[PDB]
């Protein structure tokens, strides 16, 4: 989740993005510097 | 803007507390975590607190952090010589999108007498009347806890403009002295009825005045 | 451990441009967001700018916006300070920092700053007023360029009593700074007061006889 701040400055963490807050796909994609990669995590959550 | 206001001064015996106030608003502090930063005269300046109350490892257990509405408070208990530093509050702004700095406090740790300062303010020379140009110094010594606030007036009006003022430093008895200059051109010197240098100082202030005549 | 030293300090005049280089090292620079700070001569500190981890955004306080960018080189891992149109308001240490790994509204570790002096003055000696009158009196030492000024009285002998202040940039480019003594007023009129001020970056001396206020 994007608060708006100064977070998107910050190295993307699934751990805090994804699990600790709900994440979008371009967030994630974020963390995974790749998009295949992304999607296939997608599939889960 | 900058606003985060915090208190000049504060200060305290070796072992006792102290706390610091970081006074902001809405946009700022109200919506966002406040850090504090610890300053020594001429060195970087170091992470004390973070996210209000969070301590980076390293800073002793006796600092610690607060928060109510749109104010923060740095609290610091059983004082240490090394702590006697500036001390600067911290918080983004939703509102101007930007970092706020707070205005600074200046923590001393006390070793001798608070002293009031005795103030003295010289007119401009005639000598640099002639060179066609201005200054009033107003020269602050004497006092303890080093932090001053001036404030210059012309005649009874405040003046913020062409004015210098010195970091309190200190003298051969240990004791500290400021300065303040307040640049004018003749004219100015001339037309007013008089000019004023306020010194405030631990719950005082000290005013001189001169004139023209 | 986490270092970071500025560099690229120094005298420039208005309007000019100047690249200040923050060279980091004991940590992945990539990994982290930085920031650029800066303090005016006695003043508090005021926050400039922030740059992504990665470079792709940043943001500016107002007061450099348009003027001054921000960038980085994380394969040299090095960040960057352009300042273009350079102000005497843009006088005083630049301060680099890093952010935490995940809040970049915080500032863990910075550097030694950088000192940036904006001014179109060049090598100058001091012109000397005096401050006239236990008695204050006092000389007035005004308009001179590189800092090291030095006073004393009456050619040294005079010395419990005195103090002379740290220099103040003015808005004219050039220095100024006071020092004073406190001497028995009984003694005005029949002991005379000289202020000795040595300016050697100008290989100039001047002493100034301090007289008792005759119109006033
Ligand atoms: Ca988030
Ligand atoms: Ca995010
Ligand atoms: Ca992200
Ligand atoms: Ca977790
Ligand atoms: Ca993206
Ligand atoms: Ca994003």
Redesign the pocket.
């Known amino acids: 989740?994007?608060?708006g701040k100064l977070?998107?400055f910050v190295q993307?963490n699934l751990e805090r993005?994804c699990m600790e807050?709900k994440?979008?796909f371009e967030?994630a994609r974020?963390v995974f510097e790749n998009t295949e990669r992304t999607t296939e995590f997608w599939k889960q959550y | 803007q900058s606003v985060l206001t915090q208190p000049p001064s504060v200060s305290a015996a070796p072992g006792q507390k102290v706390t610091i106030s970081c006074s902001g608003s809405t946009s700022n502090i109200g919506n966002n975590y406040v850090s504090w930063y610890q300053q020594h005269p001429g060195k970087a300046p170091k992470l004390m607190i973070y996210d209000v109350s969070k301590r980076p490892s390293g800073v002793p257990d006796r600092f610690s952090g607060s928060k109510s509405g749109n104010s923060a408070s740095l609290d610091i208990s059983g004082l240490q010589s090394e702590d006697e530093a500036d001390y600067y509050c911290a918080a983004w702004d939703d509102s101007l999108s930007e970092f706020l700095f707070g205005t600074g406090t200046k923590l001393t740790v006390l070793g001798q007498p608070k002293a009031a300062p005795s103030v003295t303010l010289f007119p401009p020379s005639s000598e640099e009347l002639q060179a066609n140009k201005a200054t009033l110094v107003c020269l602050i010594s004497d006092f303890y806890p080093g932090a001053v606030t001036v404030a210059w007036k012309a005649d009874s009006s405040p003046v913020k403009a062409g004015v210098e003022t010195t970091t309190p430093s200190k003298q051969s008895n240990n004791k500290y002295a400021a300065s303040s200059y307040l640049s004018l051109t003749p004219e100015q010197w001339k037309s007013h009825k008089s000019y004023s240098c306020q010194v405030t100082h631990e719950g005082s202030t000290v005013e001189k005045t001169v004139a023209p005549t | 451990g986490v270092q970071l030293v500025e560099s690229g300090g120094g005298v420039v005049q208005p309007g000019r441009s100047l690249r200040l280089s923050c060279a980091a090292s004991g940590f992945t620079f990539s990994t982290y967001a930085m920031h650029w700070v800066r303090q005016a001569p006695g003043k508090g500190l005021e926050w400039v700018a922030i740059i992504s981890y990665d470079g792709s955004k940043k943001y500016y306080a107002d007061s450099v916006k348009g003027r001054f960018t921000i960038s980085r080189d994380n394969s040299k891992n090095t960040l960057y300070l352009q300042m273009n149109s350079l102000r005497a308001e843009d006088t005083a240490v630049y301060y680099c920092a890093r952010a935490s790994i995940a809040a970049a509204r915080v500032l863990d570790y910075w550097g030694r700053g950088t000192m940036v002096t904006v001014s179109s003055a060049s090598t100058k000696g001091p012109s000397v007023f005096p401050l006239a009158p236990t008695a204050a009196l006092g000389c007035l030492v005004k308009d001179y360029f590189p800092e090291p000024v030095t006073v004393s009285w009456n050619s040294g002998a005079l010395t419990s009593g005195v103090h002379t202040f740290p220099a103040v940039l003015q808005s004219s480019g050039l220095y100024s700074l006071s020092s004073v003594v406190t001497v028995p007023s009984s003694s005005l009129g029949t002991q005379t007061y000289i202020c000795n001020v040595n300016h050697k970056p100008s290989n100039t001396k001047v002493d100034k006889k301090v007289e008792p206020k005759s119109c006033d």
């Open positions: 989740y994007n608060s977070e998107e993307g993005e807050e994440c979008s967030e974020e």
